[PDB]
Amino acid sequence: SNKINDALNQHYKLNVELGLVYAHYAHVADDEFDMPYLGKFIQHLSEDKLGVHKEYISDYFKRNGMKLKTDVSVAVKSIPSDAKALIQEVYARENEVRDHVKAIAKLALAEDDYESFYFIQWYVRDGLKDLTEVDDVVKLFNSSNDKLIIEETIKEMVEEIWG
Amino acid sequence: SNKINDALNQHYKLNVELGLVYAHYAHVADDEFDMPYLGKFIQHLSEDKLGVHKEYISDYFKRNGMKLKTDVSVAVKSIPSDAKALIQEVYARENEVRDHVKAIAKLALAEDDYESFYFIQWYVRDGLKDLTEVDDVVKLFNSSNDKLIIEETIKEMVEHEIWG
Amino acid sequence: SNKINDALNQHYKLNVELGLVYAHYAHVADDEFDMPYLGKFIQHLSEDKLGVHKEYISDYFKRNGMKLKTDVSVAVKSIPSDAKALIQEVYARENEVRDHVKAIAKLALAEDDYESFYFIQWYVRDGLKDLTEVDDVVKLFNSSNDKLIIEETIKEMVEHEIWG
Amino acid sequence: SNKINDALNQHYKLNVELGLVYAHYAHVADDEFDMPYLGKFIQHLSEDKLGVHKEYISDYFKRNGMKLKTDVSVAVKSIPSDAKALIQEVYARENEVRDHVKAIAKLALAEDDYESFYFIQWYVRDGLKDLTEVDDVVKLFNSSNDKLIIEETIKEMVEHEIWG
Amino acid sequence: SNKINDALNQHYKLNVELGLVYAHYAHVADDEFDMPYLGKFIQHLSEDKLGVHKEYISDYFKRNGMKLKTDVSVAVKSIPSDAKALIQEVYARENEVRDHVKAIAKLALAEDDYESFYFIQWYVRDGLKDLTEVDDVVKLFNSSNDKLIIEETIKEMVEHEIWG
Amino acid sequence: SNKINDALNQHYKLNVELGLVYAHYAHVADDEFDMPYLGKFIQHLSEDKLGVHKEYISDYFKRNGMKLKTDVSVAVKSIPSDAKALIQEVYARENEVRDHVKAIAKLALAEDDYESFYFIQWYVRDGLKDLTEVDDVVKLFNSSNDKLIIEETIKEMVEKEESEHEIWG
Numbered sequence A: 001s002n003k004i005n006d007a008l009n010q011h012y013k014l015n016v017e018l019g020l021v022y023a024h025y026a027h028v029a030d031d032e033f034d035m036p037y038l039g040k041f042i043q044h045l046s047e048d049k050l051g052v053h054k055e056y057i058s059d060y061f062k063r064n065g066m067k068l069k070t071d072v073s074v075a076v077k078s079i080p081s082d083a084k085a086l087i088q089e090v091y092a093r094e095n096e097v098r099d100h101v102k103a104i105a106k107l108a109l110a111e112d113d114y115e116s117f118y119f120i121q122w123y124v125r126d127g128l129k130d131l132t133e134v135d136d137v138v139k140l141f142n143s144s145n146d147k148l149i150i151e152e153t154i155k156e157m158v159e160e161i162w163g
Numbered sequence B, C, D, E: 001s002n003k004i005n006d007a008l009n010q011h012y013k014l015n016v017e018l019g020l021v022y023a024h025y026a027h028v029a030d031d032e033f034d035m036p037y038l039g040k041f042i043q044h045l046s047e048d049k050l051g052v053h054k055e056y057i058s059d060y061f062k063r064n065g066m067k068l069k070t071d072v073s074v075a076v077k078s079i080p081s082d083a084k085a086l087i088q089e090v091y092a093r094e095n096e097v098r099d100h101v102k103a104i105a106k107l108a109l110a111e112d113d114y115e116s117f118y119f120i121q122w123y124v125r126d127g128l129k130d131l132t133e134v135d136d137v138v139k140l141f142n143s144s145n146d147k148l149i150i151e152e153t154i155k156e157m158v159e160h161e162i163w164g
Numbered sequence F: 001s002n003k004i005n006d007a008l009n010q011h012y013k014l015n016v017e018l019g020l021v022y023a024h025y026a027h028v029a030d031d032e033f034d035m036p037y038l039g040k041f042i043q044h045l046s047e048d049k050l051g052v053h054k055e056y057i058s059d060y061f062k063r064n065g066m067k068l069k070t071d072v073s074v075a076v077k078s079i080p081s082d083a084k085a086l087i088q089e090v091y092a093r094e095n096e097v098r099d100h101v102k103a104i105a106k107l108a109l110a111e112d113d114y115e116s117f118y119f120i121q122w123y124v125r126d127g128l129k130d131l132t133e134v135d136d137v138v139k140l141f142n143s144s145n146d147k148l149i150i151e152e153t154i155k156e157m158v159e160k161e162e163s164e165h166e167i168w169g
């Protein structure tokens, strides 16, 4: 199917670009805002996006006989002004990933392609998982004004159905 | 120093783009040429370029007070026709990395910046290491015509006191 | 070489005097500002400066046939007024050590003395390491106003592949 | 008490300066007289004087509310001519430390200050201990003329219920 | 680079010839001067020179694409008359190796060849290490007149963080 | 005995020069012919010739009161053109070592010197041992045309553990 191939190539492109942006944001949070553990958190997000999230797509293309495309273009030239606004923009990016995955699932069920549906269930689940763990950190910036307290909470964060 | 900052930002950009290109080449070698172990080899190269080779630069920028820039642009739209030509183009890329690193070292010694010299010794050594391990695979395609023999040799490859 | 001998004797003198000053500052931070863990931190700095940082110089003088000189003179007559200003003056001292070491390295490379260059690489690296770990503590006094929170952070501080 | 504070500050100054002088003497004995184990012995003496012998004084000042002073001034510009004369001057320094400690103890008992008496018992005992272990080495230079024999005896030295 | 190739071939030749000469000297010291442990020491030196000190050069030539040459010519026709004069001539040979290595390092830094500089740091360090351990034995022949005492000292010799 | 001393000094000289030549050949086989395991094999040969094969002679001279001489002169200026011709020239060198050792044994038995006979039995045995293990590799270049197959065979020859024969060990 050509439209499933197109949709999965777009998701590949998206994952690569998000990973690079998160690497830059991790550097900015640790270096400029004096929060090294928030930086570790965003860096783990980046490595997640740059690893399995595209390994699985290229493995699937190897298995079923589809074609892979590589066309990357990113440029970070504007940065939020807090750690609050930083983690809020991270939240928005994850929320967009959810809706893109939903569109893919609908498409695959409209084509009678049940292997692609089985394949995309993984991403369906992982989207809500990642959004939940990002919102856990987003909500700490409302519960406290002291940066070292938030820091130790984040540190101890980083150290059945949605598994 | 501004010129050292420029040179290190360029090396960051280069490492990112090489890693992405090697990911595509690994997929092509496994899927199109029927050589899964050559693909594993090139994929390990890709992960190497996308991991520590840029972690170290961003860590150094955190330590000494320099500024990081992100501007990536890659597009793979032409592919070699063999596994031989594929690994030969990989060899050429590594050989270019060597010369870029040499230019950086010369620059850093011209500025009386000895922490940058100490820092770039790592890349100086790793360049020759990676070129050596890529040439080991390049030379197998001259020693045999049977693809399964080359395959098992590469497999048992993937499975020093100065250049360690 | 006589100028390398002079430079290394000056670095010996400097290390001794810095160690003594840091011992006094550790006592002042624990006793007068009610921060015992900041005192432990500065005391570890002092022992570092009074141990290996001069053992290595005297060992090198034994190995290559140079002469050692001892002329110490310190007097603490003024103290900062916070723990913030205290750790800030500590930061300035480390930043001066960096520049002295850089001058030594330049000198040694100008004399074709490659054993002294090899020797001073250690200090080149350790300078940035110590500056980094001191700045880690300097930046905590901007992130909080409660002394007990900063205290437990410093406590859990006190309890790399290139910069190791 | 002000006179006990003065006496303990003087003992602090004395310990620092003795430690530095012993570091220089250790270097001289190993490098110039060709006796590396005598150098190890004097170096252990130096580290002893620069460690606990002043840590205890500054800890006591923290506990009872006294004030610490730092005023160091040393200059080594004359050296004995043997290893015999070297260890003999070391013996004289230890013998002076004994008498200074005795004066402190008398003073503290004259002021009805029993915590300072309890504190100085440690130094009273350690003085005779250190003098005994230095005289053990001083007497070897009378029992033999061969330097390698004395050397191996000192080496196996470096490798009580009341005076423990 | 051709001049670096020439210099490294000369160092190869030198190492081979020194190893052979030290083998003969070890035999002479054990057989003719009745000092078997001095012979064991010089034989360890010989095996060191004939092993890694040329294995590394040939490995480097394999890695970077240089050419190896073999042209050996030694002839022992005169021998010192003591064990003292023997170990003194050994000291002189090591001191010449140091200066040859220094010339190589200068040359390699003049050509903008940073892999050769990185490579020769090993020899720069090992030169001073070997000179130090030879001088340790040279100085024993001044500290004693009894051959059996020197023998047991050398035996227990044969049985660092910067110079390691 | 002076003639036994002469013969053993010549064998010392020969062993040193063979070791150096084998070091150069190992470098050439690994670097120029793209056969790293053949290079490892020839390098083990070189270390063998430069170690015990002259340690034993100098030890014997220490024990019985003979004199040692050192006069070395080698120059490699011509190289074979294959790995086949390389291992064939190695075979010829070992075959010459055998005949030199045989001459020594005859000489020592002609002088009523039975300690030298007892001493040279070791070299008598080791000559045939080394010739056998070199011929094992020489014959692989007739059994195959693929360089990677020969390489794998040589690898399992060199890496697997050493088993001693009950007569020739």
Ligand SMILES: [Fe+3]
Binding pocket: A048, A126, A130
């Ligand atoms: Fe995920």
Ligand SMILES: [Fe+3]
Binding pocket: B048, B126, B130
């Ligand atoms: Fe690498």
Ligand SMILES: [Fe+3]
Binding pocket: C048, C126, C130
């Ligand atoms: Fe340090």
Ligand SMILES: [Fe+3]
Binding pocket: D048, D126, D130
């Ligand atoms: Fe004591």
Ligand SMILES: [Fe+3]
Binding pocket: E048, E126, E130
């Ligand atoms: Fe060595």
Ligand SMILES: [Fe+3]
Binding pocket: F048, F126, F130
């Ligand atoms: Fe053999």
